[PDB]
Amino acid sequence: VPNPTMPVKGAGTTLWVYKGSGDPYANPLSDVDWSRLAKVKDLTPGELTAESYDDSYLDDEDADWTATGQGQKSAGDTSFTLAWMPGEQGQQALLAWFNEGDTRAYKIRFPNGTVDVFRGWVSSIGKAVTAKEVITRTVKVTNVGRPSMAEDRSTVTAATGMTVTPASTSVVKGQSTTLTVAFQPEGVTDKSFRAVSADKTKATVSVSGMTITVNGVAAGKVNIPVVSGNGEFAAVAEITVTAS
Amino acid sequence: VPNPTMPVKGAGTTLWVYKGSGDPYANPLSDVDWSRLAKVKDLTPGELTAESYDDSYLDDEDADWTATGQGQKSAGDTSFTLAWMPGEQGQQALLAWFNEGDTRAYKIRFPNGTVDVFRGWVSSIGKAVTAKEVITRTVKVTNVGRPSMAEDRSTVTAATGMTVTPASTSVVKGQSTTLTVAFQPEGVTDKSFRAVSADKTKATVSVSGMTITVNGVAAGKVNIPVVSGNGEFAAVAEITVTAS
Amino acid sequence: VPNPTMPVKGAGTTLWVYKGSGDPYANPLSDVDWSRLAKVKDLTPGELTAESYDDSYLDDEDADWTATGQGQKSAGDTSFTLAWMPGEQGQQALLAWFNEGDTRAYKIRFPNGTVDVFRGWVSSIGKAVTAKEVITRTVKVTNVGRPSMAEDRSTVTAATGMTVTPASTSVVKGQSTTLTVAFQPEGVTDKSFRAVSADKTKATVSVSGMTITVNGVAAGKVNIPVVSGNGEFAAVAEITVTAS
Known part of the structure; x- marks a missing residue:
């Protein structure tokens, strides 16, 4: 249904702020570590600009028509x-963003499956208060650096399938077992995943570089659920833990 | 019942000025040492803004784009x-406040149980005389220092109040079972979750109304993983679907 | 049928950008090395402008009025x-063109068989998001150098293809005689004429429908001169009017 080669109606556009750590430009399709800003009354995305450089010399024969070139670009001023x-x-995280000069990343997800991720700092925090109308909060973010338009991430293989094969064996205290996750629907993929213990007591899990290490903190039958990316797919694995 | 987590309609917003001698930011909720400015035709809260500071250098590798940072923040001017x-x-107190030019504190009480308290000096006093419409005095107050927004005194609770209890029964074709989630760490909570199945072939999941619904499309044992917040908590449900 | 000598309604104007490696001004009509920018909501062509140059001196006789001359011409910016x-x-090609900043060529094909060709760099890239309305990308291109207007490749013909044939008969009172003129020097000609009588008493003349008409108000021999263009060609007609 979402076709990035046909015009979209604009309804359903969504705003997120990167609350995690790492590279926000890498995998913006996933919603992991992106806090959503709900109830958006309106949004005016920033306009990429460019300054004009005067490229005229005295030696240049004739000067009837001006000659110019592109200069600095200065993407900026996304408001909503x-x-x-x-x-x-x-x-609250928005006011925290304002209160220091943090240059944080924020993404706009469009109804046609495309994402525009910018990075900037808050330069205006307002509020309009009138009767018989919902009080609104107005924000303006000055963008720094080169953004990541939706015209760059034009590959999207859509994944649609993964498997989680665990060891599913008893693990003695102090030892870490390795869980396997296959995320290769014909090889190319554009999604990540996270696994979190369903009890947090009998075992401790750690996911890093596709490597899932599970330690049997306490005896029992721990269940580790894994969810891929924003949450299109998920799986459940079991690991036994013996007291011995 | 005021609800800071839901939008409010702005009608009933009141304006107060501090006539006490303590700390205005200490207990803004109490109206003990405050004077109400009654009969407010309309209000426009001050807008927080910060100027841009150039953060570029001659030896900076890339210049094609501008690098800027947040400069000095200002609280604007509130006009009512x-x-x-x-x-x-x-x-008369307002006129004296403008007249002797001291920096006094004031506050705005929204129909939310919250309050925004500023400190500033009156920079404009006006009037509007016109027949058939009430004589209105217009005041502008330039704010100084740092305001204490309603986000300053908000409270967040993450006391691990997540629990999940499923239907834990045998579901049939054409009928959906329900799974309940408890989110009461002494009642008050501020975190959400996401619940989905493990294969989406034996049972189809749907989360709504602080509840989960599982439709038993196919017979067998199915797994439903739920992940709370940013992966701090999780739960795994087992649902059996029979032939009928 | 396109007709550059008659006004056109502007619906169907197309925008193209040069992806070839030849001379854009050579054959603009051919769309061989051109890529179309489809779904153009609206277009505003760049405006040619030239600044003023003060052409006055201290020893100038008269100075009650200002003497100025045309300065340096600029092609403006085209915004679509x-x-x-x-x-x-x-x-994606447009975004890359803005991003890497080279000066590229583009053209506008009007519903006239004509085309305007410009050379410039993208100086602004924008977006507009609103519910119930299509998402629109806004582009501004600053033009450089001398542009190639549709008047540059127009052709004029003055091959002396003027001929005049009257009815050369006897006209009566109350009846009007016709006279024909040929302006076909192999077909193409844009030079007009003017036809009138020599006394306006024996016969009254009227030119319309690319045809002369003579009303025989009075009997006798009357002369009708016709002059084409700026006096390069002429013709003389003799019309006899009888008593009846």
């Missing part, structure tokens, strides 16, 4: 207003 | 127009 | 807003 909910995270 | 009642206290 | 299709070629 959303419903005012002072006690909800993402809006 | 209220009915002219010169004979009442509160307007 | 078109539907956002990030996944299609042509918009």
Whole structure:
């Protein structure tokens, strides 16, 4: 249904702020570590610009027509207003973003499956208060550096399938077993995953570089659920732990 | 019932000025040492803004784009127009506040149980005389220092109040079972989750209304993983589907 | 049928960008090495402008008025807003053209058989998101050098293809006689004429429908001179009017 080669109606556009660590430009399709800013009244994305450089000399024969070239670009000033909910995270995190000069990353997800991720700092925090109308919070973010347009991530293989094969063996205290995850639907993929223990007590799990290490902290039958990327697919594995 | 996590309609917003001698930011909720500015025609809260600081150098590898940082923050000016009642206290106090030019504190009480408290000096006093419409006094206050927004005194709770209890029964074709999630770490919670199946072939999942619904499309044993927040907590449910 | 000598309604104007390696001004009509920018919401062509140059001296006799001359010409900037299709070629090419900053050629094909060709660099890339309305990408291209207007490749013919044949008969009172003129020097000609009588008393003349008409108000021999263009060609007609 989402066709990036046909015009879209604009309804359903979504805003997120990178609350995690690492490279936000790498895999922006996944929603992991992206806090959503809900109840967006309106959004005006930033406009990439360019300054003009005067490229004229005295030796240049004739000067009837001006000659110019591209200069600095300076993407900036993405603004938006959303419903005012002072006690909800993402809006509190927004004021935290304003209160220091942090240059954080934020992404705009469009209804046609494309993402535009910018990176900037908050330069304006306003509020409009009128009767018989919901109080709105208005934000403006000055963008720094080169952004990541949706015209760059034009590959998208869509994945659609993974498997999780665990050891599923008893593990003695102090030893780490390795879980296997296959995320190769014909090889090329554009998604990540995270695994989190369902009890957090009998075992401790760690996912890094596709490597899943599970340690049998306490005896029992621990269940490790894994969810891929934003959460299109998931799986459940079991690991026994023996007291001996 | 005020709810800071839901949008509010702005009607009923009140304006107060500090006539006490303590710390205005200490207990803004209490209206003990505050004078209400009654009969406010309309209000426009001050807008927080920060200027841009150039953060570029001659030896910077890349210049094709501008590098900037957040500079000095300002609290703007709050402007409110209220009915002219010169004979009442509160307007004489406002006129004296403008007249002797001291930096006083004031606050805005929204229909949310929250309050935004600023500190500033009156930079404009105006009037509007016109027949058939009430005489309105318009005031502009330039804010100084750092404001104490309603996001400052909000509270977040992450006391591990996540629990999951499924139907834990045998579901049939054409009928969906329900799974309940408890999110009460002493009642107050601020975190959400995401629940999905493990294969999406034996059972189809749907999360709504603080609840999970599982449709037994195919017989067998199916696994439903749930992950809370950013992967701090998880749960695994087992659902058996029979032939009928 | 396109007709450059008659006004056109502007619907169907197409935008193209040069992806070849030849001379863009050589054969603009051929769309061989050109890629179309489809789904153009609206277009604003660049405006040619030239600044003023003060052409006055101290020893100038008269100075009650200002003497100025044409200075340096600029081609302005062409701004077009078109539907956002990030996944299609042509918009990715546009984004790369903005990003790497070279001066590329483009053209506008009017519903006239004519075409305007410009050379410039993209100085602005924008977007507009709003519900119930298509997402639009807005582009601004600053033009450089001398542009190639559609008037550059127009052709004029003055091959002396003027001929005049009257009815050369006897006209009566109350009846009007016709006279024909040929302007076909192999077909193409843009030079007009003017036809009138020599006394306007024996016969009254009227030119319309690319045809002369003579009303025989009075009997006798009357002379009708016709002059083509700026006096390069002429013809003389003799018309006899009888008593009846």
